[PDB]
Amino acid sequence: ESPIGVVVSSRRNGPWAELTLVLTPQELDQGKRLLLGELVRVSSGGKDYVGMVLDGYYEPVGRSDPTYTLALAHINQVDLEKEDPWARKEVNFYHHRIVLLGRVVQGGLFAPSTRLLPPVVEARVYRMTEEELQRLLAAEVRTSGSVKAEGKRRYAFGHLAYGLEEGGEYPEVVKEVDPALFVGRRTANFGKTGFGKSNENKVILTLLAHAFPRVGMLILDQNAEYLLQTEATTSPGLAQAFKALGIRGRIRFYTAREEAWARRLKEHLGTEWREYVEVLPLKVDFYHFPELAVALAYQRRRLQGAEPPQYLENAFYNLEDWKHIPDRMAYVYGALRKAGLTPRKGLKIKYKNENYDISEEKSWGNLQEAMENNSQRGDNKGGARELYSRAKVFSFLRAFHAPGKEANFLETIKEDLLGEKTEGEGKVVILDLPSLGEAADFFTLRLMDLLFDRAVELYGKRQANFLVVLEEAHNFLEDKAGIFYRVAKEGRKYGIGMLYSTQSPASIPMEILSQTENFLVKHLSSEEDVKVLKRAKAPFAFVADFLLSEPIIGYSYVYFEPYQPFVVPLRVKLLEHVLKSLDS
Amino acid sequence: ESPIGVVVSSRRNGPWAELTLVLTPQELDQGKRLLLGELVRVSSGGKDYVGMVLDGYYEPVGRSDPTYTLALAHINQVDLEKEDPWARKEVNFYHHRIVLLGRVVQGGLFAPSTRLLPPVVEARVYRMTEEELQRLLAAEVRTSGSVKAEGKRRYAFGHLAYGLEEGGEYPEVVKEVDPALFVGRRTANFGKTGFGKSNENKVILTLLAHAFPRVGMLILDQNAEYLLQTEATTSPGLAQAFKALGIRGRIRFYTAREEAWARRLKEHLGTEWREYVEVLPLKVDFYHFPELAVALAYQRRRLQGAEPPQYLENAFYNLEDWKHIPDRMAYVYGALRKAGLTPRKGLKIK
Amino acid sequence: VVLEEAHNFLEDKAGIFYRVAKEGRKYGIGMLYSTQSPASIPMEILSQTENFLVKHLSSEEDVKVLKRAKAPFAFVADFLLSEPIIGYSYVYFEPYQPFVVPLRVKLLEHVLKSLDS
Amino acid sequence: TSPGLAQAFKALGIRGRIRFYTAREEAWARRLKEHLGTEWREYVEVLPLKVDFYHFPELAVALAYQRRRLQGAEPPQYLENAFYNLEDWKHIPDRMAYVYGALRKAGLTPRKGLKIK
Amino acid sequence: VVLEEAHNFLEDKAGIFYRVAKEGRKYGIGMLYSTQSPASIPMEILSQTENFLVKHLSSEEDVKVLKRAKAPFAFVADFLLSEPIIGYSYVYFEPYQPFVVPLRVKLLEHVLKSLDS
């Protein structure tokens, strides 16, 4: 209840007002210290201001020579702490710099900065208490003289901390976050690898599922750390988090390794694991969907110089026309069978006028010979015949082919997220991208194009209401004509949110960064990464030096646009403690 | 075990916390000195910090005029050491700056930098011991309240040194690396030629080969230095190191001068050199891979303004299609034959 | 992949070596690249590099870009700029190393004599 | 609580000045009925936002030519030729037959009674 | 190979003399090239050079480039800029020479007289 020190000066340094505080020898003996980045209370003329410690330095006070006094005692082996108390009282001062961030007025409105500069005899500095700190983190910017809205329930996201220093942690001062900030808005996760990215991504997704049971998710799992993230560690995944919370029939898992994941799911979720996770195949029968086979081959590696062959281009554009002619479709099916794709039993074609059986080895030989008897003159050289002759281009499709499937998981996911009968009620979709091998990039881009077009059709009727979780976003957001770039720019108009994570803010386009609403930043060691962060968001200039020099795991700076007063340093809660708290 | 000097100032300079201390005449006469870049211990408030010596200079202490005093002592031919000791002790001070890197807490956790700034009357500076240095070099970053992870075996890489200055070499403080740091990640080697790049690269490759016998290497040797010892140097190559370590049948050497390299390998490794190194040709049959020849023609020098001919462009972009028409392949084979490339016996075209 | 004089290959952002250096971690391909001109290497590769071994550099731009890439290299700029010592290198292995460590590096002969024992 | 231009015009008594173009006429008409009342047709006029591409093929050609072009732009030659010579083609009927046939094969339903030569 | 007015042959990266300078050490071909403006030589060739014999330079760009290539030349930049002395040369042989040494070079007549004895 006493002032920390004495205010000796004040001024305005650019757009911010600052004051100088001095700690006396009597106070330093009692152990009174000020940490950097700490928030303090400044009282001047009946008004309370919000302050922050910026700098600390040593200056002589009065007519003293600290260097001569201290050096002389060392030479004479004089113990200042015990033998010469009067020489210790004249050099034991310390200075600090405090900025005035603003005020909390009315009913939680935050008035930024100030136009009144306090005189040195009217200003006092106090240490904030836990009750005051709780009301400070709830302050927010609204217009003027208006009533606070209140409303949706809030959830604890993390508690205030000032680094790893002893006494700088406040477990009871928690920042409560309304999960509505992550619905329909962009969220960026920055920081070095292995500093707490996955824990705070799973915490966000667990709060969204609990608070909003009608908002879906599309998780493109690149590192396989979202379904069962036990991963020989002790941090649970979303499937285990949902089991604890009692959420059933909301996770749909797509993978090409169904047997491997089913065994893992059984040993972690128990015998009843099918009530929480549904496993679906990512393999497709290319005989049922030959248009996917041509599209996959049309957009392959194309070593250095891009050389899309003419015969693939003709088949790519005119494959739908060929489906009405059984004569031409024989070459398409024969091309797939020649490459080595195993067909289902009983599959029959209608080459010429005789029905052949591709699945049978003897009849497949007769069809092969008949395709050479006709191919003895001009006939229809080109088009379908080119595919049959150059059928080695479909060799790589063997890994993705499963006879007798008729699934088309691309259409299944669209019905899961934007289906008419699947209206609301939530649906979490997790895709095992590594199991898709080299076709993961083709199917991910094709899926996003399919989902975005359906979201536009629903405009004026209902919103999409699903979130896109993207990992290593710098590989997808760097192209101004990419589908992910368009979603991150035009997705707010159709109720589509994005939670994209990357290790470097400098690799994201500045126009994408300037539109992101929520920022969660961890340790960054690159000068350009910090500079880009300060360029996009002005408030991040007060924590720029801390980010460069403090590799602390689990320590994050959060900022939610547009009505948050300042950047709050937080120690993000572990998912294990979130589950226990949500169990009440 | 006494403080090195007296701390006279402290502040924060950017993202780091620095302090200024003074060395007294008594300490300089006994030979107590601080090396630049040396790691020291800082005691403050019952806590230990790691500090690094960054700068040193000379500044007058008190109301003294060192220039006038020294100049007038020199002018009058006065031995300050044995004739006027008071004047000598009035000006024999030195100043040093030390930055605080962080703290070691729990069982080796490293807490970086500091949010707390020490008052000048309680801070003290001590020299580090070899045991403390060994403990400090083993510290690392981990979350909180956890134990060490340990695991795989480590191999010594080098020992701490503070330059070529005497007394700054610590052979007992070795740094041990885990070779898994080099598997699947990126490593950069910077420095001008002749200052130890090749030795470090060969040490890293030998450690990786010994520790991980399942990971291969593709070495692009532009200087012909990684296989055998270079002229005027006795530093062995990878073949000699593999022979010493007993690794057999893992090196496949590709060259266009197999005879000379075989002679050198017989000279160095001996009669049984074929159990360690396999020498292979570096030639391509261009009648079976005409695309290689077409590409080699298409990315020639093109001096000054580039001059890529149209026919070479269309060949480079349409050889795949031309491979299915006999006359185009006949023309290409005829061009190759007219160039001078002898074909294999019995080759027939259509 | 062991690559020498990497500034001739990593400069081209459309080249194969740039793509390898940027995306080889996913497929399990490692890179060890050596050069005496760090300033000609793109900042993305420098900032995403894990292990660093730095020796004497006779150019201010190289040391400046080294400091810009990683913050802990800010305390060893002058020593690198002014001291041509053979076999003396500053090492930094990411991501849990506190600071840059100066080392007199062992010779290959000593390493072999230690390994065979 | 901030009113739109339609509600402000209704408050000010300004009639027949707003012409609203949308592709969701039904939903916007529902919203206008909810907000402005039964006489919303005296203030706001809702009009479609569609084009008959069989009568304006230049719009279709311009739409196809200037599309997204992911990564580096790769404009096809035939699209450029059409984009620069459709006006000339308009005076040669059997060349226009190909354009109309392509539009038909795309899936654009035509009006009743359309004839080509 | 002894080359005069080297800036006319070393400008192009695809030239034969550029390739001889860049890759000629692996085959045992040496080069001694003379030019008046160091700023006309590409920085690759300048960084690949070992021996430097520098005389009076009056342009700031030349001395700036020379300092950028070789740091030890920053100690004699002003002397080079201000003193047109005939026969006065600063020598520096890489990579083990401590500092740049200023010399008055022996004339050919005196060299012949000394070598005869």
| Maximum C-alpha span of chain B | 109
Q: Are C44 and A193 inside 8 Å of each other by CB?
A: no
CB B34 within 8 A of CB B70: no
- Tokens describing residue C93: 């292995």
Packed helices D77-89 and D57-65: angle between N→C axes, nearest 10 degrees = 160
Residue with tokens 């230690």: C114
Is the sign of the CA dihedral A334, A340, A341, A347 positive or negative? positive
Q: How many CA atoms lie within 13 A of A83 on its CB side?
A: 7
Q: Please report all neighbours of A, defined by 3+ CB atom pairs within 8 A.
A: B, C, D
Single-letter residue type at C31: M
C31 touches A: beta carbon within 8 Å: no
Question: Do C59 and E71 lie within an 8 Å CB cutoff?
Answer: yes
Q: Which residue has the tokens 């059409």?
A: D82
Q: Are B216 and C78 in contact (CB under 8 A)?
A: no
Distance CA B179, CA B214 (A): 13
Cα–Cα dist E14/B306, whole Å: 10
Dist. CA A387–CA A314, nearest whole Å: 10
With CB atoms and an 8 Å threshold, state whether C68 touches A528.
yes
Which uninterrupted H or E stretch holds A520? strand A518-521
Asked whether the beta carbons of residue E71 and residue C61 sit closer than 8 angstroms, the reply is no
- Which residues in chain A have their CB less than 8 angstroms from residue C12's CB? none
Q: Are B248 and B275 within 8 A, CB to CB?
A: yes
Within 10 A of A209 (CB to CB), how many other CB atoms are there? 22
Nearest to B192 among C2, C58, C101 (CB): C58
How crowded is residue B63: how many other Cβ atoms within 10 Å of its Cβ?
A: 7
Cα→Cα distances A94→A21, A62, A126, A485, Å: 8, 13, 17, 52
Helices A290-298 and A440-457 sit at what angle, rounded to 10 degrees? 120
Type of residue numbered E89 = S
* First and final C-alpha spacing in chain A: 36
Experimental method: cryo-EM
Q: Is A212 helix (H, G, I), strand (E, B) or coil?
A: coil
In sequence order, the 6+-apart residues with CB closer than 8 A to the CB of E64 are E39
Note whether A touches E: 3 CB pairs or more under 8 A: no
Nearest-angstrom CA–CA distance, A351 and B205: 60
Q: Which two tokens stand for residue C70?
A: 């990683």
- Cα–Cα distances (Å) from E64 to E38, E59, E70, E78, E105, in that order, read 9, 9, 10, 11, 25
How far apart are the CA of A550 and the nearest CA of chain B, in angstroms? 5
Determine the residue of chain B that is closest to A195 in CA distance.
B143
Question: By three-state DSSP, how is residue B320 classified?
Answer: helix
Confirm or reject contact between C97 and chain A (CB < 8 A): no
SS3 content of chain A, % helix, strand, coil (to 5): 40, 20, 40
Structure tokens at A469: 């979780």
* Residue matched to tokens 């919000």: A50
Closest Cβ–Cβ partner in A65, A164, A548 for B111 = A164
Contacts of D113 (CB under 8 A, 6+ apart): none
Q: Is A459 on the interface with D (CB under 8 A)?
A: yes
DSSP D55: T
In terms of DSSP bridges, do strands E32-34 and E2-4 run parallel, antiparallel, or are they unpaired? Answer: parallel
- Dihedral of the alpha carbons of A44, A50, A54, A60, in degrees to the nearest 10: 20
Backbone dihedral region of A349: left (phi > 0), alpha (psi from -120 to 50 degrees) or beta?
beta
Q: Which residues are bridge partners to C32 per DSSP?
A: B187, C2
Contact C95 A528 (CB under 8 A): no
B164 interfacial to chain C (CB closer than 8 Å): yes
Evaluate whether B27 touches B33 at the Cβ level (below 8 Å). Answer: no
d(CA D108, CA D112): 13
Helix (H) or strand (E) holding A102: strand A94-105
Helical axes B197-211 vs C108-116, angle rounded to 10°: 20
Cα–Cα distance for residue pair B292/B115, rounded to 1 Å: 62
Which string of DSSP letters, residue by residue, matches A10-49?
EEEETTEEEEEEEE-HHHHHTT----TT-EEEEEETTEEE
- Neighbouring subunits of C (3+ Cβ pairs under 8 A): A, B, E
Which among E12, E15, E95 has CB closest to B192?
E95
User: In 10 A of CB E23, how many CB atoms?
Assistant: 12
The runs of H, that is alpha helices, within chain D are 5-12, 25-36, 57-65, 77-89, 93-106
Cα gap A291→E24, rounded to integer Å: 55
A164 neighbourhood in chain B, CB within 8 Å = 105, 111-112, 144
Distance separating the N- and C-terminal Cα atoms of chain D: 59
Q: Which two tokens stand for residue A464?
A: 């999409």
Distance (Å, whole) CA B203 – CA B198: 8
Q: How far apart are CA D17 and CA D5, in angstroms?
A: 11
For helices B258-268 and B238-245, the axis angle rounded to 10 degrees is 40
Buried b (16+ CB within 10 A) or exposed e, B176-188: ebebebbebbbbb
How near does any CA of chain B get to the CA of A537, in Å? 20
CB D49 within 8 A of CB D23: yes
**Helix %, strand %, coil % of chain D (to 5):** 50, 5, 45
- Cα A489 from Cα A513, distance rounded (Å): 10
Task: Say if CB A292 and CB A284 are below 8 A apart.
Answer: yes
Instruction: Give the 3-state secondary structure of A464-507.
Output: CCEEEEEECHHHCCCCCCCHHHHHHHHHHHHCEEEEEEECCHHH
Q: How far is CA B218 from the centre of its chain?
A: 20
Q: Which of residues 36-55 of A touch B (CB under 8 A)?
A: 36-38, 55
Which of A542, A552, A540, A480 has its CA nearest to residue A505? Answer: A540
Neighbours of B13 (CB within 10 A): 12
In this structure, the strands spanning A186-190 and A216-221 are unpaired
- Å between B97 CA and nearest CA of chain A: 14
**Sole residue written with tokens 């040709």:** B281
A386 Cβ contact list (under 8 Å, min separation 6): A311, A314, A315
Please state whether at least 3 CB pairs lie below 8 Å between chains B and D. no
Measured distance CA(C48)–CA(A548) in Å, rounded: 15
Query: C35 - beta bridge partners?
Result: B190
Q: How many CB atoms lie within 10 A of CB A357?
A: 17
Measured CA to CA, the distance from residue C36 to residue B197 in angstroms comes to: 10
Cα D89 to Cα D107: distance, rounded to the nearest angstrom = 22
CA distance linking residue A492 with residue A88, whole number of Å: 63
Pairing of strands C88-93, A155-161: unpaired
Paired sense of beta strands D18-21 and D44-47, if any: parallel
Residue E71 near chain C (CB below 8 Å): yes
Portion 550-569 of A in contact with C at CB < 8 A: 551
CB nearest A479 (choices: D22, D71, D105) = D71
H or E element that contains A252? strand A251-255
- Distance, CA of A312 to CA of B8 (rounded, Å): 79
- Cited resolution, angstroms: 2.8
Residue D92 is given by DSSP the state -
- Radius of gyration (C-alpha) of chain E in whole angstroms: 15
Beta bridge partners of B10: B19
B11 vs A163: CB contact, 8 Å cut-off? no
How deeply is A34 buried, as exposed, middle or buried, from its count of CB atoms within 10 A (0-12, 13-18, 19+)?
buried
Q: Would you call B316 an interface residue with chain A, using a CB distance cutoff of 8 Å?
A: yes
**3-state SS string for A354-412:** CCEECCCHHHHHHHHHHHHHCCCCCCCCCCHHHHHHCHHHHHHHHHHECCCCCCCHHHH
Query: Which among C57, C36, C37, C38 has a CA at the least distance from the CA of C47?
Result: C38
